[PDB]
Design an enzyme around this catalytic site. Structure first.
Site, short mmCIF file in Angstrom:
data_model
loop_
_atom_site.label_atom_id
_atom_site.label_comp_id
_atom_site.label_asym_id
_atom_site.label_seq_id
_atom_site.Cartn_x
_atom_site.Cartn_y
_atom_site.Cartn_z
N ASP A 11 -11.34 12.16 -3.87
CA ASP A 11 -12.61 12.70 -4.35
C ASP A 11 -12.82 12.17 -5.76
OD1 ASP A 11 -12.76 14.15 -1.98
OD2 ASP A 11 -12.66 16.07 -2.95
N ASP A 130 -21.16 22.82 5.87
CA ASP A 130 -20.56 23.70 4.88
C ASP A 130 -21.05 25.10 5.17
OD1 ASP A 130 -19.96 21.14 3.65
OD2 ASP A 130 -19.76 22.22 1.76
#
Length: 233
Positions: A11, A130
């Protein structure tokens, strides 16, 4: 056949590999170079690299040329994610030669564009969900939403090839619940902090869980990657 795919995460924020505590921004511990991190995972026998532009995801810039350099250094499969919301960002991402990308916010904000790109690119496209209960969330500068089951239905019927599922409230109940709503593979994202968690997720492979994205644990040396590869079959 019992085998959970493992996708070690890199990330990227402000040119660094970072820790993203929960579905949140600015809680970032830095793990140094993203290229060195990805080379470490590869060296340790990773099949996959899950590579993410957090700046593009959060609308504080981008690391497009860095992500492109990491992608070029990999001999393994690469899944790219982060701010992929239009044709030009999608084109650059696919030009890395990556195996697939994840669209997330775009699925909530421009369902028609996601529909179009799934049609054009097939299983180069996966969609991230999500989930906060039954509600979907995105990274837009305007708090978006959607119903989980309505969105799965639409994407199912759009020929969407794969989902990446994150708990935004491992949530094995949520994973199984998404497995119930689709015949398309589901990749688990987040929540893995032990090898116990991985075997728990691998138990859902027959339900339609294909793999698990692992980040935090590998960086904090909860287990080695070699140990993870053993435990997932």
């Amino acid at each position: 056949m019992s085998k959970l795919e493992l996708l070690p995460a890199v990330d990227v924020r402000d040119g660094q590999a970072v820790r993203l505590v929960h579905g949140e921004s600015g809680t970032e511990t830095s793990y140094g170079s993203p290229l060195e991190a990805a080379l470490a995972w590869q060296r340790s026998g990773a099949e996959w690299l899950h590579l993410v532009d957090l700046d593009a995801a959060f609308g504080t810039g981008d690391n497009r040329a860095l992500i492109a350099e990491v992608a070029q250094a990999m001999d393994i499969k690469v899944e790219l994610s982060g701010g992929i919301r239009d044709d030009d960002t999608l084109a650059a991402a696919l030009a890395t030669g990556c195996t697939r990308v994840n669209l997330g916010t775009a699925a909530l904000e421009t369902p028609e564009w996601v529909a179009k790109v799934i049609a054009e690119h097939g299983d180069k496209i996966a969609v991230g969900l999500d989930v906060r209960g039954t509600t979907l969330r995105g990274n837009g500068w305007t708090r978006d939403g959607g119903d989980l089951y309505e969105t799965l239905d639409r994407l199912n019927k759009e020929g969407c090839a794969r989902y990446v599922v994150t708990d935004i409230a491992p949530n094995l109940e949520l994973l199984k619940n998404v497995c119930a709503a689709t015949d398309r593979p589901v990749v688990a994202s987040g929540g893995v902090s032990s090898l116990d968690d991985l075997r728990a997720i691998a138990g859902l492979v027959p339900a339609g869980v294909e793999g698990a994205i692992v980040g935090k644990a590998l960086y904090a040396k909860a287990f080695t990657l070699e140990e993870a590869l053993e435990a997932t079959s």
